[PDB]
Design a protein around this ligand. Sequence first.
Ligand SMILES: CC(=O)N[C@@H]1[C@@H](O)[C@H](O)[C@@H](CO)O[C@H]1O
Ligand code: NA
Ligand code: NA
Ligand code: NA
Length: 235
Amino acid sequence: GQGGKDMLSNGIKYLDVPYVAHTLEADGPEELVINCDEVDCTTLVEYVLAETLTPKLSESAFADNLQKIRYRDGKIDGYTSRLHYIADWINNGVRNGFLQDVTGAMSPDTERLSISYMSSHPQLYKQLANSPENVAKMKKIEQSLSGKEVHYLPKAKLPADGLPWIKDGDIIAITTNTPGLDVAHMGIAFYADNKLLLVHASSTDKKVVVSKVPLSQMLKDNNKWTGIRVLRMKK
Ligand SMILES: CC(=O)N[C@@H]1[C@@H](O)[C@H](O)[C@@H](CO)O[C@H]1O
Ligand code: NA
Ligand code: NA
Ligand code: NA
């Protein structure tokens, strides 16, 4: 449908934008940061979704949509209000009416969430390493996310040519066997000559690209990547 076409075309607008890590991590209070010229895999998806959700004929409306995507119920309240874990990010979008969990309906396979990476490794995050308060807030979030079943598509069940229930513009969250982490990477689904490719911010290519191999191959090539969750904008 048109929503998917628009998600895809807005993602295509980001081709060649440089990959830069940690663009949201300035010192000081957590505030809404907009850096559309330097992205990572998650900020790319957030900007594309925010733009596509914003009716087009507004900087203020774009920012408001970005805020509702990036923060728990759209309320900015410190580092831990940012939806760092993609399971939580998905739940926020489902609860607040702007995402559908497509794998939730279409894939019979499920995995029990076990989320704890950030509190387990606080040295890796500036806003945790010296903030026992933030670490405690993250542990509470982690414990509430963990133990829930979610649906996913195991990577062996994803063909090169995709599946008919995965559509152009869908948001792809790549599941991972890293202990304590649910999702490792994200991008936007793009069928090119019937192959299901990914539009994504690639750290290796140092920019936003159309994948050279199908999503199925991307998954095969990383032993830690176990499958995908498929989400869809609801507008
Ligand atoms: C668990 C984790 O590391 N989540 C980070 C999140 O903190 C960050 O806001 C986002 C955009 O940079 O990238 C995610 O990977
Ligand atoms: Na699993
Ligand atoms: Na994991
Ligand atoms: Na073909």
